[PDB]
């Protein structure tokens, strides 16, 4: 599960690889509900988290609502909620394994966005709040000459009527 | 007559921002002659023992334990002369940051 990286919903998460009904240790033998998708963190927002959750189950859980199609390249379809998943299948599975890693953007994420997801790569940046300045005074007493530069919109000379 | 020079204006050594006041970066929280209030989180100390906020937030005052710098000989001696169950306490002034560090904004789709 990709915890952070959902472009639309802050409280939602992405699926990348869901395999169910694993007999013992042979994971390849078990059926895969969701095909693997490589991580695609955005260029601006870095260091996303991807968690491997392992559940041990008693019964053979079979479902049709959580199944994904063969391509499974739609972000709308790859929208997940681990809380809802565990609420739906809480009686049988119990979490027993955890493996999570951090992941940042690299040169392959653009290829993943373009070829696989068939979209335009989004670019973000870490913007900062504008500096705070007090209310401008008609007569700024004992203030430096640069006081008028703190409230200037642009460093260009405007000639109103000339 | 015999007593001279006793006249001198007060230095206004006192507290400027109380608890709950919303301060900005650089605001002088309190000025002092001796160490009465100690700086804590996001509160810097000037050369004249004045306390100034380093981040924009809300001023708070707390009572906390005092572990002095081990290079401070006087305070280290006081600590080593303290009895077994005694712990020093001091009044620290803190600034609790309000605004987040920054935001991730979309600029362009490439």
């Amino acid at each position: 599960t990709n915890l952070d990286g959902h472009l639309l919903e802050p409280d939602a998460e992405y699926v990348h690889w869901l395999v169910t009904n694993i007999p013992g240790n042979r994971v390849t033998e078990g059926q895969e509900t969701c095909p693997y998708l490589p991580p695609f963190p955005a260029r601006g927002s870095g260091f996303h988290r991807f968690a491997f959750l392992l559940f041990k189950q008693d019964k053979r859980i079979d479902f049709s609502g959580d199944t994904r199609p063969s391509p499974c390249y739609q972000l709308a379809q790859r929208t997940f909620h681990t809380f809802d998943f565990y609420k739906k299948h809480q009686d049988a599975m119990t979490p027993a394994g955890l493996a999570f890693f951090q992941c940042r953007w690299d040169d392959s994420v653009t290829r993943v966005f373009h070829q696989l997801l068939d979209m335009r790569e989004p670019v973000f940046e870490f913007v900062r709040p504008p500096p705070y300045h007090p209310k401008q005074k008609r007569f700024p007493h004992r203030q430096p000459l640069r006081y008028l530069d703190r409230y200037r919109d642009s460093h260009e000379p405007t000639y109103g009527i000339y | 007559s015999k007593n001279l020079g006793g006249k001198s204006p007060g230095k206004r050594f006192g507290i400027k921002k109380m608890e709950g006041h919303y301060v900005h970066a650089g605001n002088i929280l309190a000025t002092q002659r001796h160490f009465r209030w100690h700086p804590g989180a996001h509160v810097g100390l000037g050369k004249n023992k004045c306390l100034y906020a380093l981040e924009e937030g809300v001023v708070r005052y707390t009572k906390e334990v005092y572990v002095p710098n081990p290079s401070n000989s006087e305070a280290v001696d006081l600590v080593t002369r303290l009895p077994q169950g005694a712990v020093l306490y001091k009044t620290f002034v803190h600034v609790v940051p309000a605004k987040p560090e920054g935001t991730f904004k979309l600029v362009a789709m490439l």
Partner: peptide
């Protein structure tokens, strides 16, 4: 347009280590 093209420009990263690792 593309169904996935939605961006929600206010991107929120809930990772507590994100800013620590970005320094």
């Amino acid at each position: 347009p593309v169904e996935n093209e939605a961006v929600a420009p206010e991107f929120t990263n809930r990772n507590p280590r994100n800013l620590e690792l970005l320094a």
